[PDB]
Each structure stands twice: as structure tokens, then as C-alpha cells.
RNA sequence: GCGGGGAAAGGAAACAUCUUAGUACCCGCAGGAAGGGAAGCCAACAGGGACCCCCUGAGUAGGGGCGACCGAAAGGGGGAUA
RNA sequence: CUCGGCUUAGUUUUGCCGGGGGAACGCGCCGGCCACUGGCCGGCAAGGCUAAGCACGUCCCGAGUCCGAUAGCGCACUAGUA
RNA sequence: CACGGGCCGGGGAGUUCACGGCCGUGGCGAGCCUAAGGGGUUCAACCCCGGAGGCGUAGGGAAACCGACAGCCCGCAGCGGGGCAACCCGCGAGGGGCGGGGUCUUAAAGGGCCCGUAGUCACGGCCGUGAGACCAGAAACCGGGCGAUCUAGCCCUGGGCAGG
RNA sequence: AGACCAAUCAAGCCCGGUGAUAGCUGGUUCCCCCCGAAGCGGGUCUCAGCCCGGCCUCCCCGGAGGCGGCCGGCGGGGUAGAGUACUGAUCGGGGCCCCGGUCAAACUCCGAACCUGCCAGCGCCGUAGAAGGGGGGAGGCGGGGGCGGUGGGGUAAGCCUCCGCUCCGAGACGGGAACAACCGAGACCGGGGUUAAGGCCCCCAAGUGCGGGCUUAGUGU
RNA sequence: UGAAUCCUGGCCACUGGCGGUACGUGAACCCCGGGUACAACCGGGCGAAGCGCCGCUGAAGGCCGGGGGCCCU
RNA sequence: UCGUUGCGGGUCCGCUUACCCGCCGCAAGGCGGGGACAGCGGCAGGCGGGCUGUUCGGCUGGGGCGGCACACCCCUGAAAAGAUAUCGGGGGUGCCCAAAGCUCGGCUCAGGCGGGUCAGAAAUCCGCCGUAGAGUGUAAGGGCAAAAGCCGGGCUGACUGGGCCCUUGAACGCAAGGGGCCCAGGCGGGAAACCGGGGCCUAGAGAACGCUCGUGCCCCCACCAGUGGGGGCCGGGCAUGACAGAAAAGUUACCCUAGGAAUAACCGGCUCGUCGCGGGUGAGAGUCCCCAUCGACCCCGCGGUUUGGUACCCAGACGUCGUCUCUUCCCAUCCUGGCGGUGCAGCAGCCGCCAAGGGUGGGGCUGCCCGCCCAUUAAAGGGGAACGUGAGAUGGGU
RNA sequence: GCCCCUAACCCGGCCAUAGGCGCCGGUGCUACACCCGGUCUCAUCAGAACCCGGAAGUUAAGGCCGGCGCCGCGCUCGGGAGUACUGGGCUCCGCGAGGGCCCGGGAAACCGGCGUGCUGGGAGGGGGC
């Protein structure tokens, strides 16, 4: 929660994740980042630009540059619902589907996380089943 | 990306071999006795790799100086260096060109 | 990995084969008359800033394994690594 | 010349231990010189014989992020001799 | 002896300062590169003085493969002057 | 259309010491050289003395400790023999290889270092490292002093502000 | 207001440490003669520095072989092409098979030119000293142009990054209108002669040169 | 903080401050044991503030979003 | 906590004379309060940017963010010897395994077919075919069929002491790491040959100083001997991933110095994806009718006018937006001159060609440029000149 | 002993001209087999295999030899083809990517033709010394 926005943009923008979880400093989920929180607010934002045409006059700092950087918790979704390694499918389908926000959190039962759940998964549920080496538990 | 160097580590087309050279390979070249002055060529044979000549060496023309044991011990030259190669008959040829 | 207890292993002193105890290698305590030990109290005392060096960032996820075979018969010590891995399972 | 207080720049190709350096500088106190000087010494079972200064021992022993670098003493030859 | 600190090549071993503890007495005490024990060897701390032989240059004398008025001391001259 | 110089005169930049490596010469040579210092002088010169000490003459090993060649082969120069010459043959310093020896490690074998002669002192040169180190150049940091006639603040004691 | 503290203040001034240090910038003074580079590889808090090699130079030892070329004998190789047979891609026809077609940097049954190892010869260099070895001093460790690998990337670039010959840097001179590296060609000094590239209507040395054909746009030169 | 006037909401998780019985941790001194003809040395005990822990504090620095059914989360 | 710290009585009580605080006094000393506390000195722990010194890495199609192309491995690039780069392409590594290690023997895999009780696509059984289409820990490439795969028997060589070579590191200096061949000691498997110093091969990897452990009838510690302790040689480990090894966070628009056109911003150069403009094509629209007017899907170009790409010149300096003023040039022409077509009745409109002599204005809004708008107008075109022109101005924005 | 000639058997080299499918023949004193048994050595669920002891039966199968056909494979053969590609030179063409000329090398697929194991040592058999 506490790291850069810097350190993870590129992952979101260039699309190499669909998603992060945020870890709190026990392990636990703080909350959801997606690109949808950097659309929803700008309080991660910060102009930059090449070096102003600093010509005939006394201006002593030409170029732009970004020296507070944004902290993850401030922007990401607080409060997110998370999932057990027995819950229903379904249930996070029906949230993927309803809010577009395609990473759930997973945790094991002292709330530790433990992995997550993207639409990728969720589509191969209801397409060929269980991962390989996998077996579906109980609901 | 620099180039790695393992020990074998341009060597896909060299330790290739044709459909019609599959499996072990004849036994003559083990019964070949070699004695210091002989000339011998470096033939990597690829199904025992752990006891060949480094890659550069395939195609040298080396001198049989002694033996220890049941390898051979040649002497031959990398450009200007001379270098030692000591190596198990399966891996070499009679040079009979002189 | 696991590891067995107990080994037949060359003993350099009986000149011979015999079996041997295995146990994790553990370190001794540091004495404080060591010389070393004795040079770093002398550079502690007195005023400035830390003397040595102190490393902080550290890289290695596992250490070397290192058992201690102990032979039955004459008590010789053979002190080996296995080789950068998790702590073997003696069983 | 004697006693005390006492840096940093720079060097270590950064830098803090370290060095620079007990230096620069400051405070006090003497003489035509000052200080030192008459074995609770050094040595090794053989013997030297107050002290200071010069040549050597010697960049040796030793100190030191055992790094940069720092660095004796006894002994020997002299000046002079109480 | 112990603790802190400055220093020293002095290193489990240099000198000292400060805080705390603190002897013995010639049948005694001190030293011999960690401490102790035995032997052997060497000495007598914690009081004072001491010529000569050694440092320096305002000054005096001599010398010079030194400079020769933008040089040589800042100053060859009514220069530490205007 | 990169920067420096208006012009002329004068000035203006690889130095010295210590230590090390190497070179060119010179002296002496299993030895080489004296240092400080002393005596004399026509008085810093010069003559003589001074061998302390340094380097060399033996190495190996952390240390205790131990402690070394003329045997064989190849062969350049050179010399000798033969030959018109070409070249062949023999001896062969130096050079190269082996063998042998000292020592360390090891249970040993093997392996490491070393061994069958040349050093030392000086003068000149080149280069390295330190010293300011070819000459010019920071912003800085530290020591001890000087400053509140300016200005900032405050204190003590004086002065001023038409008319509406 | 980080204002002001004697024209000095994100920490005064004076003198001292002090000739602070500077991998950075500027400067570095007479003549002739001999040879003559480099911007590559590896390591580095390394990327404007430095060290070890490559490349230069000087000296010495050594002592007969050496190799930027060619021919042959005996070997190595998997690129161009080819193929679609292994691994994959791909369009059609016919009954999972057969036939035809389109493809492959990370496919290969085949497979050159070419490069390269040893030996023998040729050629050339070498006793006026090959190979090899020791010692002193470096510079340099920013390269660049042409041509070739559709090199690889990129819309492309007087672009980025490799491989090879040559040239500029460090190379005068003729031609290219000018012009480091395009063509010709390598310069001690003076003179005579003949050619190279290229040119020969004038500028401008040499042809208003010779045969055939085409163009009517001053196209073009 | 910035005349006056009407007002000044919810939050002590965080960063701070302060208060606190017990418990864990927490230095030197000190005590006990081993060791050493003596020491060096080794182990244990005791254990201050502090820290952990528990509370108070927003006119302390400040913060004030979602989901679900006024309620839960 | 040690000292100051004393005196009586049983850790507690008291006391005063120490010491401390105040009053009076010139001083002497007196009075009151506190009191062995406090205060003060040493030592120790905590809080401690109040103050002092420093570090805040590199590569980089400028820097920064990211990435790690910073140490390794495979394929490709790589051009048939060797070497070979880019923030080139596709991936992987910081492990795991007492077996997944050694050896001996037997066997044959994926898949298909025939038969067979449950029984099934798939269980065990009989037979046939089956070149590997399986497996071989783990990337990729290579190897492997009486095996290098599968099963079973016996084991620990994932061994002690050493040497040589190959690669890392081409020819050509140079770590660590890895691999190969052996000699000696002593074993395992096997009839034997032979093989075993880990894993079928190519990756999984760490100097000095310090510490620790193993080892030796081991060496040394200052005159001699002894005891404790210390040091030494050889080997294993504890770590530097920025991986040939410092121990290290920001911020400066208050900023300063040395430099750099080795390197960005403006203009210029190159390029033209983008931008603007032109052409080919003709599906389709146009009542019929491709081309009066258009022009899907595609394709060929030009300009240098937007934006970008690059980094060649310029950092001891080319004054950074717009506007004002003033001059000139281009034509891809808005009007004015000429001509043609029309889905041109007229009035108007639309489209093409020649043509740059002249014109192209006044206002509202915004710092603008651009654009929108108002009233006119023959029409109220667009571009270039160091984004013309700040040693001419202006200075609203940046 | 020695030399020479020579089937099937034993040990090999090269590892398809040797392999694969189908059809037609040859071979049996000896040699190779199939074959007969399981007391012994050895072996397993299983005397199938392995191992041991044999010799009644048979050339039906294997092995070896000859022929034909197809697939696969091989070839210093014809064509493909001096084609594709390529080392060196060029003030030669093209707007350009690229092509061309000269000197020197030179494929592959495919089509046709031919081929379908060769060979070393030994035993056994024959002839001589
Ligand atoms: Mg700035
Ligand atoms: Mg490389
Ligand atoms: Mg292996
Ligand atoms: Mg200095
Ligand atoms: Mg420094
Ligand atoms: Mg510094
Ligand atoms: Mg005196
Ligand atoms: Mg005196
Ligand atoms: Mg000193
Ligand atoms: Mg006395
Ligand atoms: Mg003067
Ligand atoms: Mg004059
Ligand atoms: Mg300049
Ligand atoms: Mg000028
Ligand atoms: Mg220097
Ligand atoms: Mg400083
Ligand atoms: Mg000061
Ligand atoms: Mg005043
Ligand atoms: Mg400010
Ligand atoms: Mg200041
Ligand atoms: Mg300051
Ligand atoms: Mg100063
Ligand atoms: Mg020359
Ligand atoms: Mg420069
Ligand atoms: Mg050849
Ligand atoms: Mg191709
Ligand atoms: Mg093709
Ligand atoms: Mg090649
Ligand atoms: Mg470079
Ligand atoms: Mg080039
Ligand atoms: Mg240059
Ligand atoms: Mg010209
Ligand atoms: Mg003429
Ligand atoms: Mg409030
Ligand atoms: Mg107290
Ligand atoms: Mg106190
Ligand atoms: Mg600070
Ligand atoms: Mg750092
Ligand atoms: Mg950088
Ligand atoms: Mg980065
Ligand atoms: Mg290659
Ligand atoms: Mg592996
Ligand atoms: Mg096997
Ligand atoms: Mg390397
Ligand atoms: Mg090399
Ligand atoms: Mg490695
Ligand atoms: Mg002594
Ligand atoms: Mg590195
Ligand atoms: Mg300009
Ligand atoms: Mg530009
Ligand atoms: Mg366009
Ligand atoms: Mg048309
Ligand atoms: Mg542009
Ligand atoms: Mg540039
Ligand atoms: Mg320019
Ligand atoms: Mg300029
Ligand atoms: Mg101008
Ligand atoms: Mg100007
Ligand atoms: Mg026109
Ligand atoms: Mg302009
Ligand atoms: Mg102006
Ligand atoms: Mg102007
Ligand atoms: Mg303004
Ligand atoms: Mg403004
Ligand atoms: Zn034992």
C-alpha cells in the first residue's frame, strides 16, 4: 500500500496486469488498484514535458519534474470484497460482470493473501473447468 | 543482448545429426592405436558430448604426443596458441593426408 | 532434501570405511580474546563515527548445506557441503 | 626552546575509522641556547654502563576500513665527556 | 586494579588525564613483549641540580658556475614610503 | 555563422630532492662503497684516515628447522679436417633440453620454489610514486581576529509636524 | 522578504591552513633526420578517467625458418539456393489418405560459391638475422567515408547497432563547378618526356572528329 | 487562529504527546555458579527509564470512500 | 549506578553537621526551611535533524519513470572455421532431489487394433502392429530403443591426498565458477570387461580483512621451565545479486562552481510516419445513367505548411509566444480578367482549366495563435522570408 | 604346421544397394535350427524364457541361396542446367528497392535410367607342401 505509483504505471497502462492487489503490512488486502482508479481521480497526476525554451532571460529551473510522488493507497478502491478458495464462482463472476473491475483478491482464512482471481480465470471456469493439477472444492 | 558462453554454446548445428546417423555410431574408431607423431583430426562425435573437445576444435589437425589412460594426449593450435587437447579415440580420426 | 542419519564413508585416520554419525554444522560463539575481536573493542572505544563496515543489503535466499559426518570408531571429523540449498531434512 | 589547548582543507580516486597532525593557529613560560642527564636501565647467563645531538640499525619489528598510509627501540660508529 | 578518554609502533603489551578502589617495606619492593607459579638474571620508583658536544638569525664578518632595475627582498631611489 | 588575440616591446610554463625500475658509459671485482666524523692544507676546494653499516657471495619454509651440479643430449659463433666450390664431418664457450641436488607439501607419487657466478659504486639520461611537482583556474571548509559611522532591533536623552 | 549585519549574506570581512583539490577547461617557447599508431577486447561506483592485452617505437638475446597469395593431396562446415521430407504455417481438388499450390530468423532429406586445419610444392621474405624471448618509452582506450553482408532494427534518416576490404584522420597532386575520405594516384629538389582518371564549340589544354539511327520537348546537355 | 456577527460537524486507525496495575523485553553496577594457584573468560540471577501492551488527547499534524440491505458491512 | 554520604536506634525511623535554598550582616556569624535527599562529578541505557559530518550507483537514441539489456544459460540474429553488438527477438536461472545420485540385470515407450466378468474412453489378462509420434526434475537446443527411457537387486564415488588439460577469458594479458583425463589410498555394483570424485550435455555462481569449524604424537608466544590463554600453516563454511565485492535518503524556483554542442529546449540540417495537397481505381450513390457532382475497398505520388523521428552545427550564449510597424516573394486562386462543363430555363449555385497585375477591409470575445461570432463587402485566399523584423517597439501570456 | 580354393555356422567392419510388403522355388551326411525332457547347476506365476541333460521326429518355421513385383533407399549416369546461387572488377542500366556486363566457381527438387548389400578373420570341407 505503501509503495510509488511510479514503481506499478507502466504494468497498468501497457496493460501487462489487469489489475493489483494491495497488500497492507501484514499481508492482508487493503484494496484493489485498476486503471479505472487513475481514470476516476487525478491524484496521481502530475505534468511533465521537455525542457522549456529557456532563452534571453534569467528562469532557473527550465524542465518540469515530479518530486511528491502519488502513494498507492491513496488512489486505489478500499473495501473490495474478497474470496475464499471456496467461494462460489459465480458470486465473482457476477461481480466482474456488474463493475468491470477484473481482479479479486483471494485470501486464506486469517486473511493472508494468497492469490487472486482475474476475468481470465473466471472464463476458464466456464469454458473448460479447473486449472491443470487442480480440483474444485466444495461451495 | 550479449553473447553467453557456456560451454557448448553456439553448437546447435554442430551436434545435429541426419535422420540416417541416428543412434550409436560404429566401434572402429575406438580400435584405432594411436603413437606419439601420429596426426589425428578432431571429429566431435555427438552422442558422447561430456568427454568431446570444445567446439572450437572441430576440424583441427592435431599431434599425438602420448596417452593417459585411454585418452590421448594431442597437441594442437588455436591460431597461434597452442593448446592441449586430451581427448578419448571416439572423438578422432587417423589424418592421412600428412 | 532429505538425508540420512547415518552413512558408510571413508575415515582418513582408520584408513578405511566405516559409519558415520551425520549431523547440521552449527556455529561456535564468538570469543572475546580473539584477536580480531580484541582489535574491533580497541577501535569501539573512544569517540567517531561507526568504525566498520556493516552490510545491509543481502542477496542470498538459502545458505550452503554443511553436515558434520563424525566417524563411530575413532571420532574423526569430516565437515562437507552440499551445496546452496534449503536445510536438509536428517532422517 | 619548554608546558598546555587544538582544526579543517586535501589524501584514501566517494566516505565515516584513519590520515593530514599533535600540524596551522591560540594560551602560558624561559635562555643565550633550551629541554635531557647520573639505572626500580639494557641485555641474556656473554656482557654493556648518565645524557643530548649526528651517521646507521630501518621503512626492519610493529600499528592500520592489515587500506591509504604510519613507524620504533636495543645494538654499532662518532661529537663531547662529570 | 578498574571504567571513560586523548595519545603512542606498543600490539590481550606505550605514556598520561579524569572517576572509583588502593599496598608493602630491605626477611621488602620493581623489571625481564598476555596472566600466574617456580628458577635465574638485573635493579632500588614515587625529592633536586649538572658544564661540554646539538637549534636559530634582528645583528656582525666572509664567500658565490646566484640576479642585474618588468630581474633580484614589497623597497638599488626623501619604501613598509606615498 | 566553433572559441581566443587592437598593435608593439619586455616578461611568461617538466624543476629539485628522496626512493624504485631501466639504459649509456667509467672504476674496482667475490667482492664493491664508505656515512657521520677525525688529522693536515695554499682552509667549504684538495690529501689522508674513518668499513659502523649497506648491497653481493644460497636457498626452501608460516614456523620450528633444514640447506645445493660438470653426468648426458641438441646446437649458434668459433676452431679443426675433406672438398674446385656446393656442402659434409669432428670439437663446441654462450644458448636450449634432460638428468642430478637443496627445501616445502603429502602416507607416497606427483607438484612449488631454488641450484653448475657477478656484483657493487659512481656520472648522465628516461619513466614511476610523494613532496606545490609543467603553468593558470573553483564554488567551498577550518583557525584566530575586525566590524552595528551603513542597516535590523531595542534602550537613554534632545528636536519636528502650514492650513482646512 | 531567508531581509539586514559598512556597494559583501541559503551563513560577513581580514589574515592564516594554502601554491586546498580538480578524471574538467585554457596555455606549454629552436632546427633537421629515421620509423610511425589508436579509438578494438577484458576489468573497473565504470561510461569526459584508469589498468591488462591489440596496434607504435628503441635496444638486446637468439638462430633458420616464416606466410596478407596460388596449385594439389587429405579434412572440417550447414550459409545462398533448394525443399515443404522432421517441427510448424497455408490455399484448393479427390477418396484419416492421395494429388496440385503458397511459406519459415528462432524448420531441414539436400546443398554451393566461400572460409578454414595439416602436409607437399610454387611464390615471396629471411644469416645485412625467420621463429621465439627479455628490457625502456609510449600514444591511444570519442573515430569517420565509400562499397558489400535484403546484414539486425527503423516509415525513413547525413539514423542506431554488428561483420569485412579500402581510404580520411595522419596523405600532397589531377578529375569531379566548388567539396576529408567518389575516380585517378601516392609527393626529397630542379628540369625534359609519356600517360591515368577525365576531357577535346568558347570560357579551358586538346575534335565545331567519323558512320548510322532517334528526339521537336531547349526534352536534354 | 486572525475585527465583529452566525457558527465551528464525525474520526484517536496513523504520526505525535501524555497517563498506567500486571506481564514480556530492556545497560552499566551488583549477586551466584563454572573457569583460572590469580585473572582474562563462560553461564545464570536481579533489573531503571524506555519499548511492547492498555488508555486519554483533534482550537495536536491532520483525515472525512465504497458495497450492501434507516440498518449491516 | 559509583562517589560526595555522616551520626543514633529496629530495610525502616529519627537527627544535624555535611550539602542545598532564602533573609540579615562590611566581614565575623546569626535566623528559617530542606536534608544524607537534592545538587554536583564519573560511568551506563533511552529519547534526541536541537547541532556536526557525509552518502544519496550505473546503463540510457538528452535526463527522468520504468526495465536490468548490471552476474549467468539455451535458440535466433551470426554472413557453412573462429570472434561478433543494439533498451535486438523467443525463453530461462539464485533451485530441486537420499533420490531425481552409483552400478548390475531384465524389459519397451506414445498410440492403434483383435479377444476377454463386473469393466466403462480409460484398471488387470491374451495376441498383433507400433522409428519413438513417449519418457528423460527444471528454459531452449542437442543426445538416447537388447537405452541415456520403465521396473527390480545391491549400494553411497554427492569419497580422502594430489597432478595435468579445456572453458569462463578466440588469435592475445586476466578472478572466482564449471567440465575433462589421470596417479595413489580405500570402497560400491558386476562373472568380467568396465563404470562411479553427483544429476545425459550446455545454467543455478563469490576476493581481502574478520569470525567459526575440521585437521596434526603439527609450528610459534621475547632469559629458562610449567599452567591457562593467544597466534600460525592446510581445508569447509558465514557475503558482498551494482554478482572481478564502499557501509549510505531527500530537496533547491534562493541556489553556486567546473565543464559539455560527447547531450536536451528555440532556429537551422537530415527524414516525412504524422500534417497539407495531387493522381490511379470504380463498388456504390446520382429517377435512367460509374465519372454533372461524388468516390467505399485499395494503390502511386508531391510539398516542407502541423506534429514527430534523429542528434550534424551552435553552450567563453544566434534574445525565448503573440501583436505592432515595414518590405518583398510563392501559387496549390477567395475576388477582379479569360474559357469550359453542369442533374446550366431565368435568378442563383456547383465543378474544372489559364492567370499572382491589383484587392483581400472594419469590429465583439480570448495574452493569444487558431477559432467562433457581428455589420458590411466584388471578395473579405492561403503560405515563405533565422516559426521575416525586440542593437525597431510592446511585454498581456509562457 | 604351411600355402591355395571354398555354402549354410562363429567373431566382425561399413551400417537400408543391407530395410519393408507379397508371391514362387532351392537347401538338411555334416553345420545351423525347430525338436525331446527337467535328476543335476541355474530359473521363474510359469523348464514359456534363462540354464542344464539329450537326440525320437522334421525341413513346416528360422538361417542361407535364386527369381519376380511394389514401396523405401543408393548412384563419380542423361535431362533439369551452365539454370538458381555465388568470389573479384565496373564513371554499365534503373527514379528507386534493384538489375546488367566481364573474369572465376556452380547446385537442389524433380523426371528418366541403373542398382537392391559389399567385405575382413575363423571353424568345417577340398587340394597340394
Ligand atoms: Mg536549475
Ligand atoms: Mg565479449
Ligand atoms: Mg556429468
Ligand atoms: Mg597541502
Ligand atoms: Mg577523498
Ligand atoms: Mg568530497
Ligand atoms: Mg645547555
Ligand atoms: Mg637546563
Ligand atoms: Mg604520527
Ligand atoms: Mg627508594
Ligand atoms: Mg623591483
Ligand atoms: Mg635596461
Ligand atoms: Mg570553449
Ligand atoms: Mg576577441
Ligand atoms: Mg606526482
Ligand atoms: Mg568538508
Ligand atoms: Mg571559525
Ligand atoms: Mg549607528
Ligand atoms: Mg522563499
Ligand atoms: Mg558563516
Ligand atoms: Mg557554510
Ligand atoms: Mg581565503
Ligand atoms: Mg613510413
Ligand atoms: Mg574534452
Ligand atoms: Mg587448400
Ligand atoms: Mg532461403
Ligand atoms: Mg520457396
Ligand atoms: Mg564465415
Ligand atoms: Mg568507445
Ligand atoms: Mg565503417
Ligand atoms: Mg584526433
Ligand atoms: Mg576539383
Ligand atoms: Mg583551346
Ligand atoms: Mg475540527
Ligand atoms: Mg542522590
Ligand atoms: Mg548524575
Ligand atoms: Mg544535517
Ligand atoms: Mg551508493
Ligand atoms: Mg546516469
Ligand atoms: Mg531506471
Ligand atoms: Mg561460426
Ligand atoms: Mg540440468
Ligand atoms: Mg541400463
Ligand atoms: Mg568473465
Ligand atoms: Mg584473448
Ligand atoms: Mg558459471
Ligand atoms: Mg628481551
Ligand atoms: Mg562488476
Ligand atoms: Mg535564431
Ligand atoms: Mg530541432
Ligand atoms: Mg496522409
Ligand atoms: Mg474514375
Ligand atoms: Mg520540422
Ligand atoms: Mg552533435
Ligand atoms: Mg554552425
Ligand atoms: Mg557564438
Ligand atoms: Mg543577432
Ligand atoms: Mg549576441
Ligand atoms: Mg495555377
Ligand atoms: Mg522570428
Ligand atoms: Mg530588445
Ligand atoms: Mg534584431
Ligand atoms: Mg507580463
Ligand atoms: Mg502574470
Ligand atoms: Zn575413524
Given at each position: 500500500?505503501?509503495?510509488?505509483?511510479?514503481?506499478?504505471?507502466?504494468?497498468?497502462?501497457?496493460?501487462?496486469?489487469?489489475?493489483?492487489?494491495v497488500l497492507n503490512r501484514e499481508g492482508g488486502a487493503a484494496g484493489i488498484l485498476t486503471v479505472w482508479?487513475?481514470?476516476?481521480?487525478?491524484?496521481?497526476?502530475?505534468?511533465?514535458?521537455?525542457?522549456?525554451?529557456?532563452?534571453?532571460?534569467?528562469?532557473?529551473?527550465?524542465?518540469?519534474?515530479?518530486?511528491?510522488?502519488?502513494?498507492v493507497w491513496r488512489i486505489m478502491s478500499r473495501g473490495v470484497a474478497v474470496a475464499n478458495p471456496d467461494?462460489?464462482?459465480?458470486?465473482?463472476?457476477?461481480?466482474?460482470?456488474?463493475?468491470?473491475?477484473?481482479?479479486?483478491?483471494?485470501?486464506?482464512?486469517?486473511?493472508?493473501?494468497?492469490?487472486?482471481?482475474?476475468?481470465?480465470?473466471?472464463?476458464?471456469?466456464?469454458?473448460?473447468?479447473?486449472?491443470?493439477?487442480?480440483?474444485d472444492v466444495e461451495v | 543482448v550479449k553473447r553467453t558462453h557456456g560451454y557448448r554454446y553456439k553448437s546447435?548445428?554442430?551436434?545435429?545429426?541426419?535422420?540416417?546417423?541416428?543412434?550409436?555410431?560404429?566401434?572402429?574408431?575406438?580400435?584405432?592405436?594411436?603413437?606419439?607423431?601420429?596426426?589425428?583430426?578432431?571429429?566431435?562425435?555427438?552422442?558422447?558430448?561430456?568427454?568431446?573437445?570444445?567446439?572450437?576444435?572441430?576440424?583441427?589437425?592435431?599431434?599425438?604426443?602420448?596417452?593417459?589412460?585411454?585418452?590421448?594426449?594431442?597437441?594442437?593450435?588455436?591460431?597461434?596458441?597452442?593448446?592441449?587437447?586430451?581427448?578419448?579415440?571416439?572423438?578422432?580420426?587417423?589424418?592421412?593426408?600428412? | 532434501?532429505?538425508?540420512?542419519?547415518?552413512?558408510?564413508?571413508?575415515?582418513?585416520?582408520?584408513?578405511?570405511?566405516?559409519?558415520?554419525?551425520?549431523?547440521?554444522?552449527?556455529?561456535?560463539?564468538?570469543?572475546?580474546?580473539?584477536?580480531?575481536?580484541?582489535?574491533?573493542?580497541?577501535?569501539?572505544?573512544?569517540?567517531?563515527?561507526?568504525?566498520?563496515?556493516?552490510?545491509?543489503?543481502?542477496?542470498?535466499?538459502?545458505?550452503?548445506?554443511?553436515?558434520?559426518?563424525?566417524?563411530?570408531?575413532?571420532?574423526?571429523?569430516?565437515?562437507?557441503?552440499?551445496?546452496?540449498?534449503?536445510?536438509?531434512?536428517?532422517?
Amino acid at each position: 500500500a505503501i509503495e510509488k505509483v511510479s514503481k506499478i504505471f507502466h504494468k497498468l497502462v501497457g496493460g501487462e496486469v489487469d489489475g493489483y492487489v494491495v497488500l497492507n503490512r501484514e499481508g492482508g488486502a487493503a484494496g484493489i488498484l485498476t486503471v479505472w482508479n487513475f481514470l476516476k481521480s487525478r491524484r496521481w497526476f502530475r505534468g511533465s514535458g521537455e525542457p522549456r525554451a529557456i532563452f534571453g532571460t534569467r528562469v532557473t529551473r527550465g524542465e518540469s519534474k515530479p518530486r511528491g510522488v502519488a502513494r498507492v493507497w491513496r488512489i486505489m478502491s478500499r473495501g473490495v470484497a474478497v474470496a475464499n478458495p471456496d467461494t462460489p464462482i459465480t458470486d465473482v463472476a457476477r461481480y466482474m460482470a456488474t463493475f468491470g473491475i477484473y481482479v479479486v483478491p483471494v485470501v486464506d482464512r486469517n486473511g493472508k493473501v494468497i492469490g487472486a482471481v482475474t476475468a481470465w480465470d473466471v472464463l476458464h471456469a466456464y469454458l473448460y473447468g479447473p486449472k491443470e493439477g487442480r480440483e474444485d472444492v466444495e461451495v | 543482448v550479449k553473447r553467453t558462453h557456456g560451454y557448448r554454446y553456439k553448437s546447435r548445428k554442430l551436434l545435429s545429426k541426419a535422420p540416417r546417423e541416428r543412434g550409436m555410431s560404429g566401434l572402429s574408431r575406438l580400435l584405432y592405436e594411436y603413437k606419439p607423431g601420429d596426426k589425428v583430426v578432431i571429429d566431435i562425435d555427438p552422442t558422447f558430448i561430456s568427454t568431446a573437445p570444445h567446439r572450437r576444435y572441430q576440424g583441427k589437425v592435431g599431434v599425438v604426443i602420448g596417452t593417459r589412460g585411454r585418452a590421448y594426449v594431442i597437441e594442437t593450435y588455436i591460431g597461434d596458441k597452442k593448446k592441449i587437447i586430451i581427448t578419448t579415440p571416439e572423438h578422432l580420426r587417423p589424418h592421412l593426408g600428412g | 532434501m532429505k538425508f540420512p542419519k547415518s552413512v558408510n564413508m571413508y575415515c582418513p585416520r582408520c584408513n578405511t570405511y566405516t559409519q558415520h554419525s551425520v549431523s547440521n554444522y552449527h556455529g561456535g560463539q564468538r570469543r572475546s580474546l580473539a584477536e580480531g575481536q580484541r582489535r574491533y573493542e580497541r577501535k569501539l572505544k573512544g569517540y567517531g563515527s561507526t568504525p566498520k563496515p556493516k552490510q545491509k543489503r543481502f542477496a542470498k535466499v538459502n545458505k550452503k548445506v554443511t553436515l558434520v559426518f563424525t566417524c563411530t570408531k575413532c571420532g574423526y571429523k569430516i565437515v562437507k557441503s552440499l551445496g546452496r540449498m534449503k536445510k536438509v531434512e536428517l532422517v
